Amino acid sequence: MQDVRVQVLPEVRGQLGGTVELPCHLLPPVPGLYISLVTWQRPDAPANHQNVAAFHPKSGPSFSSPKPGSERLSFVSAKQSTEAELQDATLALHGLTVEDEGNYTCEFSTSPKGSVRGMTWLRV
């Protein structure tokens, strides 16, 4: 099975007080691959601020960090089985503030390939 990779933008520029999307896609669309999880994290944020978003095929989306928090976040394309689709893990963030600036890491957990990740700088 071919190896997979994460595609993100080196930087995303969003308008202050507005909305911005952080693109993240698993490539290529390989048949036989199971995506068990995708997460977004801010490595440099305080402890309880690092886990910004997560998506599981069964349990759906979660946003543990209160900042930006679920109120300001959503996965634009990810679907949960009610079948799941996590290949596009693009994250939309509203009410952009300067305090939102920083490195964001998008990481897929997969079978059989394990984890792969990419990083994006968000500038306001």
> Which structural domain range is residue 47 located in?
1-124
Q: Which experimental technique did the depositors report for determining this structure? A: X-ray
Tell me the resolution in Å.
1.8
The set of residues, in sequence order, having a beta carbon less than 8 Å from that of 119 and lying 6+ positions away, is 8, 103, 104, 105, 106
Number of domains present in the structure of the chain: 1
Residue 123 sits in a domain of what CATH number? 2.60.40.10
The set of residues, in sequence order, having a beta carbon less than 8 Å from that of 114 and lying 6+ positions away, is none
